[PDB]
Amino acid sequence: MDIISVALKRHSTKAFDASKKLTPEQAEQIKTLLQYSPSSTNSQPWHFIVASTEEGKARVAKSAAGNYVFNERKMLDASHVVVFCAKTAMDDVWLKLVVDQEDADGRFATPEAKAANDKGRKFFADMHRKDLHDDAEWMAKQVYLNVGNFLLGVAALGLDAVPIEGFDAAILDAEFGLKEKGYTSLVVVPVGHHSVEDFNATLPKSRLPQNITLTEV
């Protein structure tokens, strides 16, 4: 159908069926969704852990303890589990990797246009690094943009999903060694198919009216 149908009909799944796996093609398509999300200046300030085995999901599920025990079941029972990570600092080696990938994909005709896109990236990166001191927050903002893109995308592939903020970030970071690699875990997204125990599957979707949230000029 159309994406409005998908947007109105998708939901946060509260229980997954562990026997209902992603097809081999959907498993590749969810990775394509992760990579091809936009970001500010194409900065792509992210890493993804995609857990598809029982071991790998159990390693992710260490993060759902303490206050966050209600999220353990979803991390273990979903087919694939995506951990969305931000960079800890925006470094010049990574700003170079972005410009040199844009070059190799053939986006600049002139070597002057290569320099003009590196300068434009630098003006944005240095605004957040040197002046406003919020580069961790700026990069995290892009990862959340990615999550939004990902949630509608997987729903349009006919897959179920739930975004999770309810996990321990220090525990997940320690398990995959993210801090020394230069990353922090932000959102965990289990993807798969819902079970009959998903009570949110049949409940109506609720949002604030547009006369509170939206102004037309």
- Interface ranges with ligand FMN (CB under 6 A): 11-12, 14, 38-42, 71, 145, 162-166, 187, 200, 205
Q: Which of 21, 129, 144, 201 binds a second copy (CB under 8 A)?
A: 144
How many Cα atoms within 13 Å fall on the side-chain side of residue 200?
15
Cα distance between residue 61 and residue 168, in whole Å: 10
Smallest distance, ligand DTC to C-beta of residue 96, A: 17
Closest CA to 203 of 191, 213, 194: 194
Residue 180 annotated in active site = no
Smallest distance, ligand DTC to C-beta of residue 194, A: 11
Residue 74 annotated in active site = yes
DSSP-assigned beta bridge partners for residue 40: none
Q: SS3 for 101?
A: helix
87 contacts: CB under 8 Å, gap ≥ 6: 45, 46, 47, 94, 139, 182, 183
Query: Which listed residue (28, 54, 137, 165) is catalytic?
Result: 165
Q: Report 64-83 residues binding a second copy (CB under 8 A).
A: 67
Closest CA to 36 of 44, 47, 28: 44
Considering beta carbons, is residue 99 or 155 the nearer one to ligand DTC?
99
Considering beta carbons, is residue 26 or 140 the nearer one to ligand DTC?
140
- Residue 166 makes contact with ligand DTC by CB under 6 A: yes
Considering beta carbons, is residue 24 or 53 the nearer one to a second copy?
53
How many C-beta neighbours within 10 Å does residue 6 have?
16
- Residue 124 makes contact with ligand DTC by CB under 6 A: yes
Q: Which residues are catalytic?
A: 14, 74, 165
* Interface contacts to ligand DTC, rule CB under 6 A: 14, 40-41, 70, 116, 120, 124, 165-166
